Amino acid sequence: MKVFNRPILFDIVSRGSPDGLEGLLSFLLTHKKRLTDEEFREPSTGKTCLPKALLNLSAGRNDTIPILLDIAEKTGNMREFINSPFRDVYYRGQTALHIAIERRCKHYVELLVEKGADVHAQARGRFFQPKDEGGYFYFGELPLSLAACTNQPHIVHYLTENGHKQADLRRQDSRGNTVLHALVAIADNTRENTKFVTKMYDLLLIKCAKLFPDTNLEALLNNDGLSPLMMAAKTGKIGIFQHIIRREIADAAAHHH
């Protein structure tokens, strides 16, 4: 018979060969194992094969992934498999969705959500960093906040509008930061950054006001006690700060004389 283990399975997925995975389903069923078992997790990180699949793409496409989820579904292990948290020196509590968003793959993002991904999995930092090469980069922890801070409107649209399970815009991270707070966090003072940060900020309020009309986003405070506007002031984010003021003056035009 055909027998499997971590290194073999990790080689198959890292190379990206779907032909190698045949008779894996049968192995798991007979030996009574799942892909989330410690023996198939990289002990150093906690990564299963799914992240490793997403970290090795042949022009944005690893073909092991679709079958991996099909197999997971046939062993009563789908929700667990997708949401399996791993860690590196930069982050703990990462998930397959974070990588899917990070690498900017709409398709794999769509797939995971539809098959039961946790849209509120928080990628928390570890020990802290500099600006120089340090793939840390605080983005607000949540998948929505990550996508927002990397200029990916279609993912934001999907995460909010999808049929299976939607991403709550009101959701706050460990710092107390909503997606708006995150947009301020990343906001540097260059016009092209300020372009999309401003654009994404306004799109979200417009989106939220509709869905949850009895709650204002920019009204929610963080653990410092600050709002997106005030935090922009304190941390010195000029471009975004002006825009929020410049916006509300325009919103005061709900007052005809």
UniProtKB/Swiss-Prot annotation:
Binding locations of ATP: 47, 52, 56, 91-94, 103
ANK repeat ranges per the UniProt record: 92-121, 139-168, 224-251
Amino acids binding a 1,2-diacyl-sn-glycero-3-phospho-(1D-myo-inositol-4,5-bisphosphate): 104-106, 151-154, 199
Outcome when changing residue 52 to A: Strongly decreased affinity for ATP and slightly decreased affinity for Ca(2+)-calmodulin
Top-rank taxon: Eukaryota
Compartments where found: Apical cell membrane; Cell junction, Adherens junction
Coiled coil ranges: none
Domain notes: The ANK repeat region mediates interaction with Ca(2+)-calmodulin and ATP binding. The ANK repeat region mediates interaction with phosphatidylinositol-4,5-bisphosphate and related phosphatidylinositides.
Function description: Non-selective calcium permeant cation channel involved in osmotic sensitivity and mechanosensitivity. Activation by exposure to hypotonicity within the physiological range exhibits an outward rectification. Also activated by phorbol esters. Channel activity seems to be regulated by a calmodulin-dependent mechanism.
Family per similarity comment: Belongs to the transient receptor (TC 1.A.4) family. TrpV subfamily. TRPV4 sub-subfamily.
Assembly notes: Homotetramer. Interacts with Ca(2+)-calmodulin.
Protein name (database record): Transient receptor potential cation channel subfamily V member 4
Organism: Gallus gallus (Chicken)
Residue range from the parent sequence: 133 to 382 of 852
